[PDB]
Design an enzyme around this catalytic site. Structure first.
Site, short mmCIF file in Angstrom:
data_model
loop_
_atom_site.label_atom_id
_atom_site.label_comp_id
_atom_site.label_asym_id
_atom_site.label_seq_id
_atom_site.Cartn_x
_atom_site.Cartn_y
_atom_site.Cartn_z
N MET B 359 0.81 -1.22 0.00
CA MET B 359 0.00 0.00 0.00
C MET B 359 0.84 1.28 0.00
O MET B 359 0.58 2.20 -0.77
CB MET B 359 -0.93 0.00 1.21
N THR B 382 -3.24 -8.29 3.66
CA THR B 382 -2.63 -8.36 2.33
C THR B 382 -2.11 -7.02 1.83
O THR B 382 -1.26 -6.98 0.93
CB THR B 382 -3.64 -8.91 1.29
N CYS B 383 -2.59 -5.92 2.40
CA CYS B 383 -2.15 -4.59 1.98
C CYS B 383 -0.74 -4.30 2.49
O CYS B 383 -0.07 -3.38 2.02
CB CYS B 383 -3.13 -3.52 2.46
N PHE B 384 -0.28 -5.10 3.46
CA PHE B 384 1.08 -4.99 3.98
C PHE B 384 1.90 -6.23 3.62
O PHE B 384 3.08 -6.31 3.97
CB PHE B 384 1.06 -4.83 5.51
#
EC number: 2.3.2.26
Lengths: 432, 416
Positions: B359, B382-384
């Protein structure tokens, strides 16, 4: 019907659903009707059932067997016999019956005896038949030289003029007992159960039937063919019905010479011939009677070790009694491998304990007088454990004619238990 | 614990059954395991994929397929393909396409058809058409651009792209289309969870997590939310008590995700389901549908291990050794499901795992120690590209838990 083994918050309900699907799948496969299946596609389903526990397989077996009873009108059927002639009278009464008639409910009546419980009379009747079929006077079965208490087909059965008809009758009775869900005290050789399951024998099966021939085979396997002053061909001598004959193991076997590439193949074929060659017609008669009641493809879900347990039942094994009457060679009673062994054996369930007893003694039959009276080739022979000094990556080997376990010096308990557990299971048909 | 004995049994059951179904030369209904067609949802991916393609061929067997020409410009492949194919019938679309580029050398038609599918998949996502936009969280995954109405003819185009994705599936040819997890759920008609917002609207997700974990009185603040559909803003009614929160969060997430794009999706799904029956595609999970369309990736675990970060854990921690041992023991499908579980997609970055994007920019795969009780599954964000791994007591437990976490769909541990 069939059962499977046995988080916090929202994950518990997720798991129980996951758990239920797995059970639903197993049950749906085992409940599924198999009578539209040909033998090829059915054998594929057997590759799945075969991996299940014994009691599950026994339960599936009985379910499918009753499904084969659809379209039958079962009646009570009388069997009139004399206490002095139970075997021959039962033959007269039942051997001409049809397979469908044999699925009727038998009630036994002894000639002119007081009326007793029909259920118990049937149990009494089975007990007597299982005993008399092995009576030497009929010359149908003989004890194996190695394991003493196990039987196979007598090749000299042709002394009895009706033997082929009687072998079919005996096969019918063994199947009928299984069908009736009644245990028999008929203990056959491992190789005989293989015949029923349509499996080839291994060279290891020869040890308890013909000891010296077995040794010749081991020598052949372990040494070069050139170390023999004689040559070998793909042919062997067989004495069927008192008539000797030289049969070819493979299509032109008399002109084919036994090379190093051929040895394993030679040993495989020659053993099959020697084991079944002199008895092929008696055996074919037995299997006809058996398969009439219990289809071959259906009984094939069991292993040779399990088929015996199906017919004769699961025994209770007094491990303390066995341990008290175990001899040790190279090992001592306090050797680490021996302490591991006994701990491992006790950790086995009832079926695997029985499979172990089959593995080292050649049968699941426990001696009535305890393990101090365990019989072997050379007389009374106690269970004995020897140390195998070869590399530790092989399985434990057994020699049932001596009631002997060859146990390698394994490095850990986890390894010993795992290796022993593998050894007591069915072996492959591999030639080596 | 008796639960682990059951998991041990379940995996044995899984391995044995599926392996038999892979060796099978029969259709699943014709074979001995015919009963399983009613439990096809629970089998391994490749097994369902075999069943899927077999069933697809069986349902269209009564059709007499011929070769069909598609005339396009190599420089204008996307818009030309729209012209040639978008008004065609479903039965026509089930014919065998052979592509002809305007005034170009006649080449191997099988190889030329693979080139036409790869070029159209790259052009679907060109911002110039304004059909799809990347998700803020996972960056390389796409969903419907709510501002698709800039072009008034867009609904007609959403149906066309849905047709091309389905056509690619039908033809058994892979596409480089990587959608968001939430998008695949839309195709399967599944509701999204509050966790799905994390990669779509990070700040809104935080508000939802706060609402769920704390009392409503700690806010100071109704079943409604703002939606900007077709550039026209509106407050749409979903249907705010502590007892109702479970309900509130569920509805609002659906709305924010599907409110501004509901007609664009309906157009896409109309186009998709014309070719591929809905009931047939619904045997797959949201994770698996991607693998069907985009294929199973091959993952260089050595490359991944070299570019893994550790927090609270160290590289030599026993749980990390177990983790890599567990991952290596997974089959290709489960390895892919793992990659999907922690990154948000099965797409391996072309530049290797040293260039994994997150992100806030470039973010390597990272494993944190979860210090909460060890009776929960591994969590992912999942963004990290982050895996939250509890300090599990044994390898067998860690592996079993990880396997359950990566296979989890919105219907629970594997579809019900």
């Amino acid at each position: 019907d069939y059962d499977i083994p046995t988080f916090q918050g929202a994950d518990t309900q997720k798991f129980l659903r996951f758990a239920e699907t797995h059970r639903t799948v197993l049950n749906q496969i085992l409940r599924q009707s198999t009578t539209h299946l040909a033998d090829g596609p059915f054998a594929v389903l057997v590759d799945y059932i075969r991996v299940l526990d014994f009691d599950v397989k026994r339960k599936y077996f009985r379910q499918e067997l009753e499904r084969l009873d659809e379209g039958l009108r079962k009646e009570d059927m009388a069997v009139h016999v004399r206490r002095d002639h139970v075997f021959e009278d039962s033959y007269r009464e039942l051997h001409r019956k049809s397979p469908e008639e044999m699925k009727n409910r038998l009630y036994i009546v002894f000639e002119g005896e007081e009326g007793q419980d029909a259920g118990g009379l049937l149990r009494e009747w089975y007990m007597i038949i299982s005993r008399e079929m092995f009576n030497p006077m009929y010359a149908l079965f003989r004890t194996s030289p190695g394991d003493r208490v196990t039987y196979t087909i007598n090749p000299s059965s042709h002394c009895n003029p009706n033997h082929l008809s009687y072998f079919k009758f005996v096969g019918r009775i063994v199947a009928k007992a299984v069908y009736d869900n009644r245990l028999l005290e008929c203990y056959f050789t491992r190789s005989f159960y293989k015949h029923i399951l349509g499996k080839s024998v291994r060279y290891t099966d020869m040890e308890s039937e013909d000891y010296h021939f077995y040794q010749g085979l081991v020598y052949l396997l372990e040494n070069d063919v050139s170390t023999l002053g004689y040559d070998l061909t793909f042919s062997t001598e067989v004495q069927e019905f008192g008539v000797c004959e030289v049969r070819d193991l493979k299509p032109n076997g008399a002109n084919i010479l036994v090379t190093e590439e051929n040895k394993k193949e030679y040993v495989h074929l020659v053993c099959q011939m020697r084991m079944t060659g002199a008895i092929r017609k008696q055996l074919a008669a037995f299997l006809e009677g058996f398969y009439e009641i219990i289809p071959k493809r259906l009984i094939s879900i069991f292993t040779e070790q399990e088929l015996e347990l199906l017919i004769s039942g699961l025994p209770t094994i007094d491990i303390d009694d066995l341990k008290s009457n175990t001899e040790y060679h190279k090992y001592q009673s306090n050797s680490i491998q021996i302490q591991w062994f006994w701990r491992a054996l006790r950790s086995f369930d009832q079926a695997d304990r029985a499979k172990f007893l089959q593995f080292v003694t050649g049968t699941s039959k426990v001696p009535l007088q305890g393990f101090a009276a365990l019989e072997g080739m050379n007389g009374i022979q106690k269970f004995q454990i020897h140390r195998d000094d070869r590399s530790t990556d092989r399985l434990p080997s057994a020699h049932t004619c001596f009631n002997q376990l060859d146990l390698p010096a394994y490095e850990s308990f986890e390894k010993l238990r795992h290796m022993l557990l593998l050894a007591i299971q069915e072996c492959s048909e591999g030639f080596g």
